């Protein structure tokens, strides 16, 4: 036969699903493990038969178990079931989203939250800047990026954004389509305000002395909207 | 002199010069180019056969007497497709040629002498190739390693620390202490191994200390922040330490576009992972860097070959991992700029032209670690069915296409990571990491694996039986997998600087430890059979791909070879 | 239960065969692994039942799968299936030879050969010698044995065979029944012509000087058909 | 071995059976204790043979090989110093006493002696590497000097001589004979006659014991597969009918009951079953 | 004239003394204090006339006991003396 | 110059032959002025078989103990390097 370890693991999964199906035929309400095994085994057999696509199987997996077929709490625990199966065109991943609707009140690991909002970046006053994407490709900017050093095809008054970042929730982002124009909110970077990296326009302590060097560097490298005056005076370390 | 018919000669000794063989259930036909044997003096083992004392086993052998000989093998390599006997001594390939006993036979050189210390392995009717080399491993679970070993891969290069969230996204083992953890854990396994460090920093001292701690290179990944500053600093340190750099570029175009990344690279050597861009990279035009001279471009296996289920599967994978919602117009706009069936369709044809040069897995991180070799040969078979036989072929065979696709997982990644003096091909003086295939099962299920000159894995029936053949037959560990023998049969690759400071003695490693070299002076022209450079353009609106002005695409397939005929799941 | 590892492996094989049988009942054409598993599991159950011999099961295994039951290419890949099973008289090996006939054209790993013959031992001129077995037991001689030193119950003109071997394909043999007489073809041994072993009649370089010593030794040890003259003169090293 | 207990409170307790605070107890009432079995005909084809033999009650395995190579599939031989080093370093894995046999099929005394110095406990002489009288003589000469054992699979084809020529080459020296009945190999048809001799230690392998109604057909079909014989050729049929011989197979059980055969063994995965030596011994009894 | 590899301690690194394998294994280099490279000879006993490159002819040779004529496979073999050779007086003052 | 030295092969004492090889020689020379007899030829070839070294010979010009076929019988098929084989420098007269 020349079986691989993958084939042995899938054989075990198939017979777990068969046990779940026999217990369902005897009238027993299925638990969490039994329901997951039953859905996975059904998808693998349908893909072996070769008459259905993966997208059709993603919808067919949602009709296998009624809400009355499982114990109370099972449906809230199963958010998705994934399984890889070999089609005539090879191995594909099939994910079944929310296969069972709930019918009882038991939610394991339930969260009970207060209703007060959370205030982020307290004590930081924001300013508003209009930004336009004049390039031909989309741009997306994260919450803690140094906004002065973003993609040179974005056009905005870059002098007002030195030492600042977006005032949004940490880990979220703002998207600019080609030709799109909108306003954003910016707040001061905290901590020691030592800015290293990002386009290597600063690489030192952020202050008013380092802003002139950064503006001159940004103009020489063609960043849009940068205004630094002519007859610039160099320092000993630039 | 006697006459023997061709059919019974082939039944006794395998195919010879001019004969042809089909590879697997594909439409690829290989032809024997040359034979080293002398007709009438073939080596055969058994009762009444030739490998006996005083006949082909010498009673006065040379002082370079072999430890093991593989008789009547059909070698398939980037150097050629030919019939020979293969001799192994002290963990190395000692000779490729005729072999036997000079006391009784004509053309036997000293390095192919068969004596009382020699063991025999029958290769008549079988194919020998070098072990595969996978350069895009996420070290998420140790169970990936036996899965890759049974498919025919004998070297794994990547990074990680186990199932943590950083490893689930990136091929990175960060810092000296985590490198020590992974290097000491590596003593368990039957696989050559090498580890990549974190390249996403602008601190030169932090970059240099990881190389001295044992890493063979850097990975730069957008989840740790791929900025032009970090690219510049990492390339500067890698120039000084003679190690390779790999990159996953900025998908969001946050700090710049693709030309800004190329300006940061500034003509220096770079290995690009999943260059088509479905796995990540500058939307929508990362694929244009595959025409450049200093880029070594690679593709990962879940996008090859292009099938009718590919786009929907990748779209639903993208929706799960990023937690997107179809009711938001920005998540839909993000997803439609990511997947792009136009570039996915172009990728197969670019592989057939020799513009892409390396295939890899991206294991458990949108990719399948046991399917690199199989999906490579599926892509070759689909391209032969669509575009016909290549114009570079000489004769009624597919030998040029076979060499071009075989180079993608054997010799080209070995050159790219600076280990081609040790592994990657069947040549005299290299490490004996070899794979034996039956031609009916070529590309999907091998017969046995030889690791460091000793057998490490094979198909094997039940242990209580009277012969090794009866059922159930599955892959089982052999004697080179066990005890202190596995220390002598496996290699851990490190940097030259870590090797010179005595990393083997400092960490107490018992495996062989060898340094990588010649990583910085190679370009696209050093890739065997895949060395094409061109000018590549991507339309910013329709995402069509042009190569020197001509549009490049392919059609999806509803059926592939080497899939449902061979596997129960 | 006190299960052994053999029992666990055979249990896995049985349920692989059961999965193959269920897929055959659903109308799915079986692949290579499924066909091998189905035949093996059927043989094991029939041997447990205890009403049939192993030789009958060797023929019964060839009727389980019609040519239309399997995918194209399966029948050319399965040359034999072997399985050990416990009968009432103990464990026996049952091998099923060519269980499925082919019906399509796909042959995986197919060989395409030229039609020209191969000439072996080119440039070697052969001589013909008549050989008779005057013993009571059969004798079989391989292709690279030193023919001068074969079993002493073979009768032939041994002087003409010094330094020679059979001119047949490498690894084949010639058989002599008791009382049988036939002719064979012999060619010169190649290489350095240093002959060590086989009956220890030479153990040195083969030449005309060593032939006289070998003939004297063969006559003293009773090899049939050896003619060496009387009044033999010894050398300093024999 | 005796009574055991505490001399302060009980009568017949000797010093070497004293039970104290450092002692652990194991209850053997109603149970049988024997020594572990010793199997001397192991082909080291796969490491998975070792747990199978261990669970059946065997605690020492002696044989040769390098894994699933074609030489090991036929013969119990670990050839040469480097391959002996491989197997000795792999042996640190297992729960089994182990010992390895070297290649005896050569006429070079220096090659024979270097294998013994590299760690082998003896030689195997096998017809697939060529069992000639010269090789038998040289191997016995070296084994006399190094105090190790020799095992032999003799010439089935009678190519260089018959059974009396092999016995003349042995010349009265001590020899262990594998599968002496001859179904596993040996001088056709009369290798079984050496089991009456003084200097021979004769052994049988387990697939021929006990003699059952399925034995002959199973062994015949095993012979047809391994030699790739065809029933349409009169010489393959004549070869097969001189090999199997139900007469000697039937005689083997009675010779075991008379004390003429003295050792049982497996011939593991090479026409024999590594987990069934003890069971087939008691079935024959 | 002698060049730089002929002199000093450089001549130790550029020259080889050949010995037997047995003397090499017993440490003859350290015992006698030799500074040259020391290497063993090997494969001396398993070679014949057939191992000589481009000069590997075997034949039956007979010499007449009275006239001293030489025959190779029955045919007489001889040559004529020369009164002048190349590469001699054109190139050397003595 | 690369250098290698030959030892005395003209003896019938095996221990004396073996000690010269262990002292550093790469082979033996057998020369008629120290006495080239069939006994010495036989003993020297026996030791050289065990130590893997070459033998060279200047044969008996005077035919004192035997002729050329007796020397070849003493050699007994083993490998031998013959110096000045034409015979003007020495060797069995005249053949
Ligand atoms: C298309 C895809 C598939 C998967 C399994 C993950 C991602 N995914 C999620 C977050 N970031 C990424 S891209 C990194 C990668 O998959 N390899 O480097 C995208
Ligand atoms: C009767 C038989 C059974 C098997 C499994 C193999 C052979 N067979 C094939 C070639 N040579 C031999 S005999 C060597 C042996 O089985 N043990 O030493 C014979
Ligand atoms: Ni990536
Ligand atoms: Ni990745
Ligand atoms: Ni045997
Ligand atoms: Ni055996
Ligand atoms: Ni001289």
Automatic annotation (TrEMBL), chain B:
Secretion signal span: none
Residues modified as N6-carboxylysine: 219
Cofactor(s) the protein needs: Ni cation
Tree of life domain: Bacteria
GO terms (BP aspect): urea catabolic process
Family: Belongs to the metallo-dependent hydrolases superfamily. Urease alpha subunit family.
HAMAP family attached to this UniProt entry: Urease_alpha (MF_01953)
Binding site for Ni(2+) 1: 136, 138, 219, 362
Pathway named in the protein's UniProt entry: Nitrogen metabolism; urea degradation; CO(2) and NH(3) from urea (urease route): step 1/1
Record protein name field: Urease subunit beta
EC id: 3.5.1.5
Cofactor binding, per record: Binds 2 nickel ions per subunit.
Urease domain segment(s): 131-569
Subcellular location: Cytoplasm
InterPro entries: Amidohydro-rel, Metal-dep_hydrolase_composite, Metal_Hydrolase, Urease_alpha_N_dom, Urease_alpha_subunit, Urease_AS, Urease_asu, Urease_asu_c
Post-translational modification: Carboxylation allows a single lysine to coordinate two nickel ions. Carbamylation allows a single lysine to coordinate two nickel ions.
Active site: 322
NCBIfam families: PRK13207.1, PRK13985.1, urease_alph
Subunit structure: Heterohexamer of 3 UreA (alpha) and 3 UreB (beta) subunits.
Any one GO molecular-function label of the UniProt entry: urease activity
GO cellular component: cytoplasm
UniProt KW keywords: Cytoplasm, Hydrolase, Metal-binding, Nickel
Recorded catalytic activity of this chain's protein: urea + 2 H2O + H(+) = hydrogencarbonate + 2 NH4(+)
UniProtKB/TrEMBL annotation, chain E:
Reported modifications of this chain: Carboxylation allows a single lysine to coordinate two nickel ions.
Signal peptide: none
Compartment list: Cytoplasm
Record-stated family: Belongs to the metallo-dependent hydrolases superfamily. Urease alpha subunit family.
Subunit details: Heterohexamer of 3 UreA (alpha) and 3 UreB (beta) subunits.
Name of the protein in question: Urease subunit beta
Organism: Helicobacter pylori (Campylobacter pylori)
Part of the intact protein present: 476 to 569 of 569
């Amino acid at each position: 036969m020349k079986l691989t370890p993958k084939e042995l693991d899938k054989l075990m999964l198939h017979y777990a699903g068969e046990l779940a199906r026999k217990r369902k035929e005897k009238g027993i309400k299925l638990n969490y493990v039994e329901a997951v095994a039953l859905i996975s085994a059904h998808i693998m057999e349908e893909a072996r038969a070769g008459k259905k696509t993966a997208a059709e199987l993603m919808q067919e997996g949602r009709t296998l178990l009624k809400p009355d077929d499982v114990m109370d709490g099972v449906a809230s625990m199963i958010h998705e079931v994934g399984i890889e199966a070999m089609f005539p065109d090879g191995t594909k991943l099939v994910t079944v989203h929310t296969p069972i609707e709930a019918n009882g009140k038991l939610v394991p690991g339930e969260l009970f939250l207060k209703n007060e909002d959370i205030t982020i970046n307290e004590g930081k006053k924001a300013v508003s800047v209009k930004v336009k994407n004049v390039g031909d490709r989309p741009v997306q900017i994260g919450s803690h990026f140094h906004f002065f050093e973003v993609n040179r095809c974005l056009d905005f008054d870059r002098e007002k954004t030195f030492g600042k970042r977006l005032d949004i929730a940490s880990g979220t982002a703002v998207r600019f389509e080609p030709g799109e124009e909108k306003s954003v909110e910016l707040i001061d970077i905290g901590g020691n305000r030592r800015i290293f990296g990002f386009n290597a326009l600063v690489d030192r302590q952020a202050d008013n002395e380092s802003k002139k060097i950064a503006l001159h560097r940004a103009k020489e490298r063609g960043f849009h909207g940068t205004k630094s005056d002519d007859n610039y005076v160099k320092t000993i370390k630039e | 002199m006697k006459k023997i018919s061709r059919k019974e000669y082939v039944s006794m000794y395998g195919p010879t010069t001019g004969d042809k063989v089909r590879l697997g259930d594909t439409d690829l036909i290989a032809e024997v180019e040359h034979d080293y044997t002398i007709y009438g003096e073939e080596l055969k083992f058994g009762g009444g056969k030739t490998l006996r004392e005083g006949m082909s086993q010498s009673n006065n052998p040379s002082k370079e007497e072999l430890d093991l000989i593989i008789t009547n093998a059909l070698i398939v390599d980037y150097t050629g497709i030919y019939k020979a006997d293969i001799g192994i001594k002290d963990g190395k390939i000692a000779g490729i040629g005729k072999g036997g006993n000079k006391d009784m036979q004509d053309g036997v050189k000293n390095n192919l002498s068969v004596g009382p210390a020699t063991e025999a392995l029958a290769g008549e009717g079988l194919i020998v190739t070098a072990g595969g080399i996978d350069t895009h491993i996420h070290f998420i679970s140790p169970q990936q390693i036996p899965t890759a070993f049974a498919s025919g891969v004998t070297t794994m290069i990547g990074g990680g620390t186990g199932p943590a969230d950083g490893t689930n996204a990136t091929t990175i083992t960060p810092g000296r202490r985590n490198l020590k953890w992974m290097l000491r854990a590596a003593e368990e396994y039957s696989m050559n191994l090498g580890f990549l460090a974190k390249g996403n920093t602008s601190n030169d001292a932090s970059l240099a200390d990881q190389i001295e701690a044992g890493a063979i290179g850097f990975k730069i990944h957008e989840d740790w922040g791929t900025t032009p500053s970090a690219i510049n600093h990492a390339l500067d340190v890698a120039d000084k330490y003679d190690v390779q750099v790999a990159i996953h570029t900025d998908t969001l175009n946050e700090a710049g576009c693709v030309e800004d990344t190329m300006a940061a690279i500034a003509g220096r050597t770079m290995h690009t992972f999943h260059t088509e861009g479905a796995g990540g990279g500058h939307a929508p035009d990362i694929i244009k860097v595959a025409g450049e001279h200093n880029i070594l471009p690679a593709s990962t296996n879940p996008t090859i070959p292009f099938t009718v289920n590919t786009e929907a599967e990748h779209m639903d994978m993208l929706m799960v991992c990023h937690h997107l919602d179809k009711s938001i117009k920005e998540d839909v706009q993000f997803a439609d700029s990511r997947i792009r069936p136009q570039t996915i369709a172009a990728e197969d044809t670019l592989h057939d032209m020799g513009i892409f040069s390396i295939t890899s897995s991206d294991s458990q991180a949108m990719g399948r670690v046991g399917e690199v070799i199989t999906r490579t040969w599926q892509t070759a078979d689909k391209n032969k069915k669509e575009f016909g036989r290549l114009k570079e072929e000489k004769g009624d065979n597919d030998n040029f296409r076979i060499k071009r696709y075989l180079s993608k997982y054997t010799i080209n990644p070995a050159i790219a990571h600076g280990i081609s003096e040790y592994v990657g091909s069947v040549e005299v003086g290299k490490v004996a990491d070899l794979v034996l295939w039956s031609p009916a099962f070529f590309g999907v299920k091998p017969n046995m694996i030889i690791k460091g000159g000793f057998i490490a894995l094979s198909q094997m029936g039940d242990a209580n039986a009277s012969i090794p053949t009866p059922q159930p037959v599955y892959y089982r560990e052999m004697f080179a997998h066990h005890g202190k023998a596995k220390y002598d049969a496996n290699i851990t690759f490190v940097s030259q600087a870590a090797y010179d400071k005595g990393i083997k003695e400092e960490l107490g490693l018992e495996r062989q430890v060898l340094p990588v070299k010649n990583c910085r002076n190679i370009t696209k022209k050093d890739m065997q059979f895949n060395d094409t450079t061109a000018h590549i353009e991507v339309n910013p609106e329709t995402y069509h791909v042009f190569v020197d002005g001509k549009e490049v695409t392919s059609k999806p397939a509803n059926k592939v070879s080497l899939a449902q005929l061979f596997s129960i799941f």
